[PDB]
Structures are given as structure tokens and as C-alpha cells.
Amino acid sequence: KPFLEDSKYQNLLPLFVGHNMLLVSEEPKVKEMVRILRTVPFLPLLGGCIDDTILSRQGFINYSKLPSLPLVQGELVGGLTCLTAQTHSLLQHQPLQLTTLLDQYIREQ
């Protein structure tokens, strides 16, 4: 508690009433930890701090459900093509309509 008061983790003080234990890893392994903790129904997850961001129990649950960072990095890259294809698709109706008409002409013959 004296450590937390003088450090940046001042909002973690209420979480340390009574018996407490710390589950810490060099990298975020929330999804692995949660399923192991779910095996014990009476063990509570009081929250904590991930990457200098204090989160509650639901924050850890949401963090685990969030996809991996490399996939999230590519989502911004993936969205760039959507912006470019948006304007292109506006004028793409005419080529699609013309192709269908030509195909039907052969079928009727």
C-alpha cells in the first residue's frame, strides 16, 4: 500500500483489502489466465493494470476477446482498400450490367 500511494497505481488501493495475490507475466496472457481461473468458481478476479491501464474484471474479459495486435494492425491496412474500393464500386455498376446483358444474348440464341 505505501508503494501504490506514491506510485502511478494510486487507484489500486481498494483492491488490496484482506488476502491478495498477484498474477503477473511479462506479456499479456489474459485468455490463458481466465480459463484457468474459471475452473475455480469461487476465485474472484478483482482486476488489475495492463500496459499502464487499470481495468476491472470485465476489462480483462473484453481484452481477452479482442483479437491479436498483428491482426488489429492489418485492420487499418485492410480498411484502406475499402476506402479506395468505395468510389470505384460506385461506377462498377455499369460494367456489371453490360456483362450480364451480353451473357443473356448468347443464352437466348
Binding site: Q10, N11, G47, I54, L55, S56, Q58, G74, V77, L80
Partner: protein, 46 residues
């Protein structure tokens, strides 16, 4: 110097003011500058 508290589950979605400044900057820049920015970002992230 002190981390903000965890927002309530029932509270509406809230975004930190630091990100708000970045959002307005992106819209100001032209697509040609962003397209050159996008090319550098894709190689940098790899």
C-alpha cells in the same frame, strides 16, 4: 502521473482526450499525403 480509474461497465463508451486530437488531424490531411503516409505505415509495421 496517476493512472485513471477503470470506467464502470454500465457507463457509456468514453474515449481519452489524447486520441481526440489525432482524429481531427487525419481528416485535415489530403488523401495524397495519407496515401504516401499509408505506404510508409504498411512497410513500417512489417
Amino acid at each position: 502521473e496517476a493512472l485513471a480509474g477503470a470506467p464502470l461497465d454500465n457507463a457509456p463508451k468514453e474515449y481519452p482526450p489524447k486520441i481526440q486530437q489525432l482524429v481531427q488531424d487525419i481528416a485535415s490531411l489530403t488523401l495524397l499525403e495519407i496515401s504516401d503516409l499509408n505506404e510508409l505505415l504498411k512497410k513500417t509495421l512489417k
